[PDB]
Structure 1
């Protein structure tokens, strides 16, 4: 019961907020919840409303394209037209819950429609019907809402005439003690699976809290625009630890520490960019493990030395690096034989990225946001991993002469395939696959919620409900209400649909909107693979130049500094060639003034392939020429010997 998003561990802050919430709602007064994006507004409010015998809840999520027709339809399914508008329950009141009231957009003259509608309906206690023109008095329907601060982009500053009616409550981040207690409860619930380590629930929770605090204090938003942490990261750490323990083998203490460290690597440090930042995080893990888990016989906690995967066995355990590389090589050979053929070179970084993509593609409602340079191998690795997991890859064919109709019908086809035909789908979305902000809003809708509402409406809604009833009857299930059918539909979509975002230019304004979007950031798992480092370039170059004749001249080992050699210490001509190629790639990207943009390794790969072909051709020509001159010299010597003899 940690996969359930509705569970709330009762602490002093939670009961305090629930008590003031009941005091405000019973006071006939709207409530606005404001705070940081991980404070816990939604879960506190849903816990307070679900566990009440006097209030029902209505779920509404605001987007930029939101009209009052959505609110009218949401109320109409929980009220009866008898004027006077009343909730269906006679004793229990009705509460209308709005998500992120900052996100509705101003019109051409600076006025959000829905907030003015809400101010009208909780100031005059009623509203005027547009097509019939009578005043529908509302007696006991309440309005609440949550919002991020208006400082960050996407959160529009809000009119005081609307907020003057609703009481404002601020929810700060919980303190260290509260987080420690909450995650102690979570870790006790996890370690109920393995009772022999039940005495370690407190140090794991304290270590996780300390790790989150240190990561929040170290990598501020001033370094990169996406270096923001929250308790949601800790909750995802707990969920990942439970998911790995549940399907894992029999565990030891060292295995548990390494598993938790791997989860910390995959959650707290896949958004990191700089190599110095990753080294600092590795030192942070070592310090945290030494401080809170004073255990010996602990191996390397580097990024490439923690390979936890379930491809090589029936259970989620640590796998040998070389065995995993051999398995990945053979699987990629089969994949290129059956699907599109790309001559890829296997290295440690690609293996690690395959592991983390596979980890994030096996989660329920697990989505990815791959950020890195072009030609780093994001689309091909995503296709390979989705082929490994049995998902079906859907790549939107979006070209220049395309509009919302083609993208929307592609989305509808994918959703219908997921629901009716019950086929898992990995939707790969590129930054060039979107063209306008409307596609971005469609992705926000599909990712924040489990459905896109306006795709199916009217005749489409009716045929969707008919198909849902047909599928439910064919599966031998009995669902009658349209709410139950819609819940089954959104559950099937959240189970059978994964969205992977491919971003090539993170400094672009469109990609900045993609990264800073609230629904995309709070749901996707960022995997900033970035540009290639020296070790990966060395491995690729050594795997590429080993198939060409290169060592055929005398070589003397050059004296050089230790920091100028990226490969193994120089012993032959091949290591020298690799060092020169990497050094020139670095110098070329330095003198081209890339700034801080990611450096595509496409030039390096093209240069390596051209060098291999050219060296092969030139060596063959040189060997032919040398054989020609030596056979001519031998014939000349034979002729002069025959002349001398005769």
Structure 2
């Protein structure tokens, strides 16, 4: 009710109309100029607190007539009860661990409370937690238990921690906050779970994937890395051809995108920075799971109708042909607020009620009738068909948002959007760290003219080596490149995360090409002078 905007001189005409309805019990008919008296019609309003962005404080002349009820998030003890029921329902699958159903709920609620207390909107706009996060954690634990092997108590705790990492700590920025979450998770496990058998609990040591086997279980790091390498070679050979170096962080991001695309209704936004791999990782993960990629294409300024027909085609393929689409929505693919509204209402229930209206609605209902008859699931009423349609869209359409630096007005607007925020797994991958840059450069400097230059390995203080200790030129060149990249970014520009390394990859490619060409020229010069000397010796 506080959503409508003010006028030039203040006041909202719709809110004043509501005040007229509540106080004077009537209104004036504009074109007939007559007074109408409404009988026994009640007015009920629902609004977010005024401190939320996009909320305008209404006039007290209006709220004076209504009883304001604050329906806040349920307590800190009601959540404990509710999720005790939830964990009992989950642990019906594994009754051997029935005694641990209460400590799990207590630890989940304590985790939620600590995350709310530590990370707040004062740090990032996207630090907003609610019981929805706890429900997502419960459902993720249930999905991993249902499609997993015979769970043991250590496996149960590690799985719960992995789910916690994916629900809560993915949205965190930087490394300080991630370390804070890791120590918080250690503290929660120690405080509420007397069992002490967990190894490293960090995000890089909790690798759960259903890729290497038929069960959602923990997988070895080296085996998963090799599997991803040999799958990504095939992906490049078959699909698009851009050579990409395999590094540890990309494996974790692949696992995250996989678990999101395997959800019943799972959408993700990859809010990082350009030239990181956000789109290509989504394409690769969808290729692994056999999802059809749809990337909307627009001209300089496409009307909303083009986006509407793109959405309609994607929805039809998802529902009537079970294509299991993976729609990738880039920031450039959004240029007006109508697109954002269409996305948020698509994510709202499951779909667009608007794209099907009139004759197209009749054709859609005929197609739904025939499809439901084909599956032998005949439904004789329109509501059942539309429910089946909504369910198919929910379980077949996955929307992935690719967002560059969120400092842009459109990026901040779409991140702050309520529907997209609540219905998406926010995954902050950000910019490459020192280790990822080191690995990428190391696998890119693998060229033989890197040799032949006598390298005077220096003492090189370990606090400024970043990569592994230096014993060969490769270490020197990678350290020089990464140090120059950091110096250039900290000198030319001022800010946090302007853009992920895109100059780094181009620098490495140009370095490799230039070294190869220059050493080819040097080799032919050596051959010429040596053969000339040989002929002179022959003389």
Aligning the two structures, in what range does the TM-score lie when normalised by the shorter sequence? over 0.9
Task: Return the alpha-carbon distance in structure 2 between the equivalents of residues 474 and 419 of structure 1.
Answer: 13
Cα deviation digits, residues 417-465 of structure 1 (max 9, x gap):
2222222111111111111111111111111222222222233333333
Listed one character per residue, the Cα deviations across residues 215-259 of structure 1 (whole Å, up to 9, x for unaligned) are: 222112111111121221111111111111111101111111111
Determine which of 395, 398, 423 is the counterpart of 2:295: 395
Rounded Cα–Cα distance in structure 1 between residues aligned with 2:267 and 2:59: 35
Q: Distance in 2 between matches of 1:594 and 1:435?
A: 27
How far apart are the structure 2 equivalents of 1:127 and 1:389? 58
Alpha-carbon distance in 1 for matches of 2:37, 2:267: 44
* Worse overlay, 165-174 or 492-501: 165-174
> Structure 1: any 5+ residue segments left out of the alignment?
1-100, 640-646
**In structure 2, the residue corresponding to 1:175 is in which secondary structure?**
coil
Change (3 A) 1:132 1:467: farther
CA drift of 1:508 comes to: 0.6
C-alpha RMSD of matched pairs (Å)? 2.6
> Which string of whole-angstrom CA distances, capped at 9 and with x for unpartnered residues, describes residues 553-594 of structure 1?
322321232221111111111011100000000001011124
Aligned partners of 1:249 and 1:317 also within 8 Å = yes
Deviation at 1:378, TM superposition (A): 0.7
Residue 336 of structure 1 and its aligned partner are, at CA, apart by 2.0
Distance 1:616 1:495 in 2: 51
Q: Pick one of 433, 440, 449 that aligns with 2:340.
A: 440
Structure ID, larger Rg: 1
**Cα gap change, 1:119/1:472 in structure 2, threshold over 3 Å: closer, same or farther?**
farther
Per the TM alignment, residue 330 of structure 1 is displaced from its structure 2 partner at its CA by: 1.9
Conservation of the 8 A alpha-carbon contact between 1:548 and 1:615: no
Cα deviation, 1:25-54, whole Å, max 9, x if unaligned, reads xxxxxxxxxxxxxxxxxxxxxxxxxxxxxx
Which has the higher relative contact order, 1 or 2, with Cα contacts under 8 A spaced 6 or more apart? Answer: 2
Q: Is the 8 A contact 2:26 2:38 kept in 1?
A: yes
The Cα shift of 1:517 comes to: 0.7
Q: CA deviation at 1:496?
A: 1.4
Taking structure 2 as the reference length, the TM-score comes to 0.93
CA 1:611–1:393 in structure 2 vs 1: closer, same or farther (change >3 Å)?
Answer: same
CA drift at 1:278: 1.2
Distance change (3 Å), C-alpha of 1:481 and 1:143: farther
Q: What is the CA-CA distance between 1:179 and the residue it aligns to?
A: 2.4
Provide the C-alpha distance between the structure 2 equivalents of 1:329 and 1:476, rounded to a whole number of angstroms: 43
* Contact 1:530–1:598, Cα closer than 8 Å, also in 2: no
What displacement does 1:498 show?
A: 1.2
User: CA 1:449 to 1:352, structure 2 compared with 1: closer, same or farther past 3 Å?
Assistant: same
What does 1:207-356 correspond to in 2, within 5 Å? 207-356=107-256
Higher strand share: 1
Query: Residue 549 of structure 1 aligns to a residue in which SS?
Result: helix
Shift, 1:128, TM fit: 9.4
* Farther off after superposition, 472-481 or 180-189: 472-481
**Any conservation in 2 of the 1:309–1:317 contact (CA below 8 Å)?**
yes
Quickly say closer, same or farther: Cα 1:155–1:487, change in 2 above 3 A. Answer: farther
- 1:545 to partner: Cα distance: 0.8
Cα 1:438/1:105, change in 2 over 3 Å: farther
Displacement of 1:409 in angstroms is 1.4
Aligned counterparts of 1:471 and 1:362: Cα–Cα separation in 2: 24
Contact preservation (8 Å) 2:27, 2:35: yes
Cα separation, 1, equivalents of 2:353 and 2:323: 21
Q: Deviations over 1:620-641 (max 9, x none)?
A: 22222223222322333343xx
For 1:364 and 1:301, the matched residues in 2 are separated by: 27
> Would the alpha carbon gap of residues 144 and 548 (structure 1) be closer, same or farther in structure 2, given more than 3 Å must change?
farther
How far 1:396 moved relative to its partner?
A: 0.7
| Aligned partners of 1:548 and 1:612 also within 8 Å | no
Contact 2:190 2:196 in 1 (8 A): no
Distance across 1 between alignment mates of 2:246 and 2:138: 32
In 2, Cα distance between equivalents of 1:421 and 1:247: 26
Kindly state the Cα deviation for residue 196 of structure 1 after the two structures are TM-superposed.
1.6
Contact 1:372 1:598 (8 Å CA) reproduced: no
Runs of 5+ unmatched residues, structure 2: none
**CA, structure 1 residues 236+460, in 2 after alignment: closer, same or farther (shift >3 Å)?**
same
Number of positions where the alignment pairs a residue of Structure 1 with one of Structure 2: 539
| 8 Å CA contact retained: 1:431, 1:504 | yes
Q: Which moved more, 1:553-562 or 1:115-124?
A: 115-124
Q: Which residue of 1 aligns with 2:3?
A: 103
Change (3 A) 1:625 1:257: same
Taking a change above 3 Å as real, the CA distance of residues 245 and 431 of structure 1, as seen in their structure-2 partners, is same
Deviates more, 1:375-384 or 1:467-476: 467-476
The 1:277/1:358 distance shift into structure 2, 3 A limit, reads: same
Tell me: CA distance 1:424–1:103, structure 2 relative to 1, closer, same or farther (3 Å).
farther
Residue range with higher mean Cα deviation, 398-407 or 136-145? 136-145
Q: Is the 8 A contact 1:187 1:204 kept in 2?
A: yes
